[PDB]
Structures are given as structure tokens and as C-alpha cells.
Coordinates of N, CA and C and ligand atoms in Angstrom, one line a residue:
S1 N 22.9 20.2 -13.0 CA 21.1 19.4 -12.8 C 20.8 19.8 -11.8
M2 N 20.3 21.6 -11.7 CA 20.0 21.8 -10.8 C 18.4 21.7 -10.3
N3 N 17.6 21.8 -9.5 CA 16.3 21.6 -9.5 C 15.1 22.2 -9.7
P4 N 14.7 21.9 -10.7 CA 13.1 23.1 -11.2 C 12.5 23.4 -10.3
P5 N 12.5 24.5 -10.3 CA 11.5 24.9 -9.4 C 9.9 24.2 -9.4
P6 N 8.8 24.2 -8.0 CA 8.1 23.3 -7.9 C 6.7 23.4 -8.3
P7 N 5.2 22.6 -8.4 CA 5.1 22.0 -9.5 C 4.0 23.7 -9.2
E8 N 3.5 24.7 -10.2 CA 1.8 25.2 -10.2 C 1.0 25.2 -8.8
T9 N 0.9 25.8 -8.0 CA 0.1 25.5 -6.9 C -1.2 26.5 -6.9
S10 N -1.4 27.7 -7.5 CA -2.4 28.4 -7.2 C -2.2 29.6 -8.4
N11 N -3.6 29.3 -8.9 CA -3.9 30.1 -10.1 C -5.2 30.8 -9.7
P12 N -5.5 32.3 -10.0 CA -6.6 32.7 -10.0 C -7.3 33.6 -11.0
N13 N -6.1 32.8 -12.2 CA -6.3 33.0 -13.6 C -7.5 31.8 -13.7
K14 N -8.1 30.6 -12.4 CA -8.8 29.6 -13.0 C -9.8 29.5 -12.2
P15 N -11.0 29.6 -12.8 CA -12.2 29.0 -12.4 C -12.5 28.1 -10.7
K16 N -13.2 28.3 -9.7 CA -13.3 27.4 -8.2 C -14.4 27.2 -8.1
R17 N -14.6 26.4 -7.5 CA -15.5 25.9 -6.9 C -14.9 24.8 -5.8
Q18 N -16.6 24.8 -5.2 CA -16.2 23.8 -3.7 C -17.3 22.7 -4.0
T19 N -16.3 21.1 -3.5 CA -17.2 20.4 -3.6 C -16.9 18.9 -2.8
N20 N -18.2 18.6 -2.5 CA -18.2 17.6 -1.5 C -16.6 16.5 -1.8
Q21 N -16.7 16.1 -3.3 CA -15.7 15.3 -3.5 C -13.9 16.1 -3.4
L22 N -14.3 17.1 -3.9 CA -12.5 17.8 -3.7 C -12.4 18.4 -2.0
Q23 N -13.1 18.4 -1.4 CA -13.2 18.3 -0.1 C -12.7 17.0 0.9
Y24 N -13.5 15.7 0.1 CA -13.4 14.6 0.9 C -11.5 14.7 0.2
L25 N -11.2 14.7 -1.1 CA -10.1 14.5 -1.3 C -8.7 15.3 -0.1
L26 N -8.9 16.5 0.0 CA -8.4 17.4 1.2 C -8.3 16.8 2.7
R27 N -9.5 16.4 2.9 CA -10.4 16.1 4.7 C -9.2 14.6 5.2
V28 N -10.1 13.9 3.4 CA -9.5 12.6 3.7 C -8.8 11.8 3.2
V29 N -8.6 11.9 1.7 CA -7.4 11.3 1.2 C -5.8 12.0 1.5
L30 N -5.6 13.4 1.5 CA -4.9 14.0 1.6 C -4.3 13.8 2.8
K31 N -5.3 13.6 3.8 CA -4.9 13.9 5.7 C -4.7 12.2 5.6
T32 N -5.1 10.9 5.5 CA -4.8 9.8 6.0 C -3.7 9.6 5.0
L33 N -3.3 9.7 4.0 CA -1.6 9.1 2.6 C -0.8 9.9 4.0
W34 N -1.0 11.2 3.8 CA -0.3 12.2 5.0 C 0.5 12.0 6.3
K35 N -0.4 11.7 6.7 CA -0.4 10.5 8.3 C 0.4 9.1 8.3
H36 N 0.6 8.3 6.5 CA 1.0 7.0 6.8 C 2.6 7.0 7.0
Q37 N 3.1 5.8 7.3 CA 4.0 6.0 8.1 C 5.1 5.9 7.1
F38 N 5.2 5.6 5.6 CA 5.8 6.0 5.0 C 5.8 7.3 3.5
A39 N 4.8 7.5 4.5 CA 4.8 9.1 3.7 C 5.5 10.4 3.6
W40 N 6.2 10.7 4.3 CA 7.6 11.4 4.4 C 8.3 12.1 3.0
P41 N 8.9 10.7 2.2 CA 9.9 11.1 1.1 C 8.9 11.9 0.3
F42 N 7.5 11.8 0.0 CA 6.4 11.9 -0.9 C 6.1 13.1 -0.5
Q43 N 5.9 13.8 0.7 CA 5.7 15.5 1.4 C 5.9 16.4 1.2
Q44 N 7.1 16.4 -0.4 CA 7.5 17.6 -0.9 C 8.8 17.0 -2.2
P45 N 8.7 18.0 -3.4 CA 9.3 17.7 -4.4 C 10.8 16.8 -3.7
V46 N 11.1 16.3 -5.1 CA 12.3 15.2 -4.4 C 13.2 16.2 -4.8
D47 N 14.3 16.6 -4.2 CA 15.4 17.3 -4.0 C 16.5 17.1 -4.5
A48 N 16.7 16.7 -6.3 CA 17.4 15.8 -6.5 C 18.8 16.6 -6.5
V49 N 19.4 17.2 -5.9 CA 20.1 17.9 -5.1 C 20.7 17.4 -4.1
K50 N 20.2 17.1 -3.4 CA 20.6 17.1 -2.1 C 20.8 15.2 -2.0
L51 N 19.7 15.0 -2.6 CA 19.6 13.3 -2.7 C 20.9 12.9 -3.6
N52 N 21.3 13.7 -4.3 CA 22.7 13.6 -5.5 C 22.1 12.1 -6.6
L53 N 21.3 13.4 -7.0 CA 20.0 12.8 -8.5 C 20.2 13.1 -9.4
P54 N 21.6 13.5 -10.1 CA 21.5 14.5 -11.2 C 20.7 14.2 -12.2
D55 N 20.3 13.1 -12.6 CA 19.3 12.3 -13.8 C 18.1 12.6 -13.3
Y56 N 17.5 12.4 -12.3 CA 16.2 12.4 -11.9 C 15.6 13.4 -12.6
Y57 N 15.6 14.6 -12.9 CA 14.8 15.7 -13.3 C 15.2 15.1 -15.5
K58 N 16.2 14.7 -15.8 CA 16.1 14.5 -17.2 C 15.1 13.3 -17.7
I59 N 14.5 12.0 -16.3 CA 14.1 11.1 -17.0 C 12.6 11.5 -16.2
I60 N 12.4 12.2 -15.5 CA 10.9 12.6 -15.0 C 10.8 14.3 -15.3
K61 N 9.6 14.5 -16.3 CA 9.0 15.5 -16.4 C 7.9 16.4 -16.1
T62 N 7.7 15.5 -15.3 CA 6.4 16.0 -14.5 C 6.1 15.2 -13.2
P63 N 7.3 15.9 -12.6 CA 6.9 15.9 -10.8 C 5.6 15.9 -10.0
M64 N 5.7 15.2 -9.0 CA 4.6 15.6 -8.4 C 4.4 14.9 -6.8
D65 N 4.2 15.8 -5.9 CA 4.6 15.3 -4.2 C 3.0 15.7 -3.9
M66 N 2.8 15.5 -2.6 CA 1.2 15.3 -1.8 C 1.9 16.8 -0.9
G67 N 2.7 17.3 -1.1 CA 2.7 18.8 -0.6 C 2.0 19.8 -1.8
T68 N 2.4 19.6 -3.0 CA 2.2 20.2 -3.9 C 0.9 20.0 -4.2
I69 N 0.6 18.8 -3.7 CA -1.3 18.5 -4.2 C -1.5 19.3 -2.9
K70 N -1.6 18.9 -1.6 CA -2.1 19.5 -0.5 C -2.1 21.1 -0.9
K71 N -1.7 21.7 -1.2 CA -1.8 23.5 -1.8 C -2.5 23.6 -3.2
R72 N -2.5 22.6 -3.9 CA -3.9 22.7 -5.1 C -4.6 22.8 -4.4
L73 N -5.4 21.8 -3.7 CA -6.9 21.6 -2.6 C -7.2 22.8 -2.5
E74 N -6.2 23.3 -1.8 CA -6.4 24.2 -0.3 C -6.5 25.6 -1.6
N75 N -5.9 26.0 -2.4 CA -6.2 26.6 -3.5 C -6.9 26.6 -4.6
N76 N -8.2 25.7 -4.9 CA -8.8 25.6 -6.0 C -8.7 25.3 -6.9
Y77 N -7.1 25.3 -6.8 CA -6.5 24.6 -8.3 C -7.4 23.8 -8.7
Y78 N -7.8 22.9 -8.7 CA -8.5 21.2 -9.4 C -10.2 21.8 -9.9
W79 N -10.7 21.8 -10.7 CA -12.6 22.2 -10.4 C -12.8 20.9 -10.1
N80 N -12.1 19.6 -11.2 CA -12.3 18.2 -11.0 C -11.6 16.7 -10.5
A81 N -12.7 16.2 -9.3 CA -11.6 15.7 -8.6 C -10.6 14.8 -9.3
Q82 N -11.0 14.2 -10.7 CA -9.8 13.2 -10.8 C -8.8 14.5 -11.9
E83 N -8.9 15.7 -11.6 CA -7.8 16.0 -11.8 C -6.6 15.5 -10.8
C84 N -7.0 15.8 -9.7 CA -6.6 15.2 -8.5 C -6.2 14.0 -8.4
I85 N -7.0 13.6 -8.6 CA -6.4 12.0 -8.7 C -5.5 11.4 -9.5
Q86 N -5.4 12.0 -10.9 CA -4.4 12.5 -11.8 C -3.0 12.4 -10.5
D87 N -2.3 13.7 -10.2 CA -1.6 14.3 -10.1 C -0.8 12.9 -8.4
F88 N -1.8 12.5 -8.0 CA -1.7 11.0 -7.0 C -1.2 10.0 -7.9
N89 N -1.9 9.9 -9.1 CA -1.5 8.8 -9.8 C 0.3 8.5 -10.1
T90 N 0.3 10.3 -10.7 CA 1.7 10.8 -11.2 C 2.8 9.9 -10.2
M91 N 2.4 10.9 -9.2 CA 3.5 11.2 -8.1 C 3.9 9.3 -8.2
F92 N 2.8 8.5 -8.1 CA 3.7 7.0 -7.9 C 4.0 7.1 -8.6
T93 N 3.4 7.0 -10.4 CA 4.3 6.2 -11.3 C 5.5 7.0 -11.9
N94 N 5.5 8.5 -11.6 CA 7.4 8.2 -11.4 C 7.9 8.0 -10.6
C95 N 8.2 7.3 -9.4 CA 8.4 6.6 -9.2 C 8.9 4.8 -9.3
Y96 N 7.6 4.9 -9.8 CA 7.7 3.3 -10.9 C 8.8 3.7 -11.9
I97 N 8.9 4.7 -11.9 CA 9.8 5.4 -13.2 C 11.2 4.7 -13.1
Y98 N 11.2 5.6 -12.4 CA 12.8 6.0 -11.8 C 13.3 5.2 -10.9
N99 N 12.9 4.4 -10.4 CA 13.5 3.2 -9.5 C 13.0 2.0 -10.1
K100 N 14.3 1.0 -9.8 CA 14.0 -0.4 -9.9 C 12.8 -0.7 -9.4
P101 N 12.0 -2.0 -9.7 CA 11.4 -2.5 -8.5 C 11.9 -3.3 -8.1
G102 N 10.8 -3.2 -7.1 CA 11.8 -3.8 -5.6 C 12.4 -2.9 -4.5
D103 N 12.8 -1.8 -5.2 CA 13.1 -0.9 -4.3 C 13.0 0.0 -2.8
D104 N 13.6 -0.1 -2.0 CA 12.8 0.2 -0.9 C 11.9 1.6 -0.8
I105 N 12.0 2.6 -2.6 CA 11.5 4.0 -2.1 C 10.1 3.4 -3.1
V106 N 10.7 2.5 -3.8 CA 9.6 2.1 -4.7 C 8.1 0.9 -3.7
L107 N 8.7 0.2 -2.8 CA 7.8 -0.8 -2.1 C 7.1 0.0 -0.7
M108 N 7.6 1.2 -0.2 CA 7.3 2.6 0.4 C 6.0 3.2 -0.8
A109 N 6.4 3.6 -2.1 CA 5.4 4.1 -2.9 C 4.1 3.4 -2.6
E110 N 5.0 1.7 -2.9 CA 3.2 1.0 -2.9 C 2.4 0.6 -2.3
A111 N 3.2 0.6 -0.8 CA 2.2 0.9 0.1 C 1.5 1.7 0.4
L112 N 1.6 3.1 -0.5 CA 1.1 4.4 0.3 C -0.3 4.3 -0.8
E113 N 0.1 3.5 -2.7 CA -0.5 3.7 -3.6 C -1.8 2.7 -2.7
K114 N -1.7 1.4 -2.5 CA -2.6 0.3 -1.5 C -3.6 1.3 -0.7
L115 N -2.9 2.5 -0.2 CA -4.2 3.1 0.8 C -4.7 4.2 -0.1
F116 N -3.9 4.8 -1.1 CA -4.4 5.8 -2.4 C -5.9 5.3 -2.5
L117 N -6.4 3.8 -3.3 CA -6.4 3.0 -4.0 C -8.0 3.0 -2.6
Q118 N -8.0 2.6 -1.9 CA -8.9 2.2 -1.0 C -9.6 3.3 -0.6
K119 N -8.9 4.7 -0.5 CA -10.0 5.7 0.0 C -10.6 6.1 -1.6
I120 N -9.6 6.0 -2.6 CA -10.6 6.7 -3.5 C -11.8 5.5 -3.8
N121 N -12.2 4.4 -3.6 CA -12.9 4.1 -3.8 C -14.3 4.0 -2.7
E122 N -13.8 4.7 -1.7 CA -14.7 5.2 -1.1 C -15.1 7.0 -1.2
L123 N -14.6 6.9 -3.1 CA -15.1 8.4 -3.3 C -16.5 8.7 -3.1
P124 N -16.9 9.5 -1.8 CA -18.4 10.1 -2.6 C -18.8 10.0 -3.5
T125 N -20.3 10.1 -4.0 CA -20.7 10.5 -5.5 C -21.3 12.3 -5.1
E126 N -21.1 13.1 -6.2 CA -20.9 14.1 -6.2 C -22.4 14.8 -6.2
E127 N -22.7 15.3 -4.9 CA -23.6 15.8 -4.7 C -24.4 17.0 -4.9
Ligands
B0Q1 C1 14.6 8.2 -5.6 N1 13.3 8.4 -5.6 N2 12.6 8.4 -6.8 N3 11.6 8.9 -6.1 C2 11.5 9.2 -5.2 C3 10.5 10.0 -4.0 C4 10.8 10.6 -3.1 C5 12.4 10.7 -2.2 N4 12.6 10.8 -1.5 C6 13.8 10.6 -0.6 O1 14.8 9.9 -0.8 C7 13.9 11.2 0.7 N5 12.9 12.4 0.8 C8 13.0 12.8 2.0 C9 13.9 11.9 2.5 N6 14.4 11.1 0.8 C10 15.8 10.5 2.0 C11 15.8 9.0 1.7 C12 16.4 8.3 0.8 C13 15.7 6.9 0.8 C14 14.4 6.4 1.1 C15 14.0 7.0 2.1 C16 14.4 8.4 1.7 C17 13.0 10.2 -3.4 C18 13.1 9.4 -4.8

């Protein structure tokens, strides 16, 4: 059970736009989550080989992490803020699916998710 390649982060064949909502997701949301005390395990794809989790990618077919989301924002991969919000939600849900409730990694994800939801509530309206 080798690791898969990381998610795609740059596609020159997709149309691009710079918007106040996408800028907020990078400059505020990704920034504030990245610096959270529990952010480290979520800053790069799950290395299931190094962590000796041979079933991780048998269970999780839509992996996602904040390093990927940072790159997607930087490369104008998303047309809409909702596409980026979905990637964050996928990251949290993957953790909740793979692990037992109350596991340390789940409590950490839950704390990151709480901060995420607060920042998404303050998502500015489209300019
Ligand atoms: C199993 N699991 N389920 N979702 C997960 C999402 C991310 C990680 N990351 C890590 O374990 C990790 N990243 C960098 C270092 N570590 C070691 C470590 C082991 C245990 C707890 C914290 C950190 C595991 C996940």
C-alpha cells in the first residue's frame, strides 16, 4: 500500500479569477489554520507508509490536506470559494471516517474545524 501522488494543485487549462473571497481564504483562513497549535498533522498529505497505516488509502479515496489547499489557492485552482470550503471539509471528514471518535487526531481536527467554521462565518460577500 504505497502512498498515492498528492492531489492536483495547478491546472493551466482551468480558467482563473482573483476574487475577494478567494483572497480571504488564503490570506485569512489558510493563514490562521496553518498557525493553529494542532495544524502540523494536516499541513501535508497523510504519509501512510511512514505512519504504518497500510489501509489508509483503502478507506480514504479523496485525501486532502492544507498544504494542497494552500497550493490550490496560490495557483488559482478554484473558481469559487465553495470549492475551497469543500476541500477543508473533506480534510476534516476524512479524519472522522478513518479514526475512532475521541482519538487524539480527531480531537485535534475538531479544534481546527471549530476555528475554520468561525472564519467561514466571517467570509466577506462577493465584491
Ligand atoms: C491517522 N490519521 N488520520 N488522519 C490523519 C491526519 C494526519 C495524520 N498525521 C500524522 O499522524 C502526522 N503528521 C505528521 C506527524 N504525524 C505523526 C503523528 C502521529 C500521531 C498524532 C499526531 C501526529 C494522521 C492521520
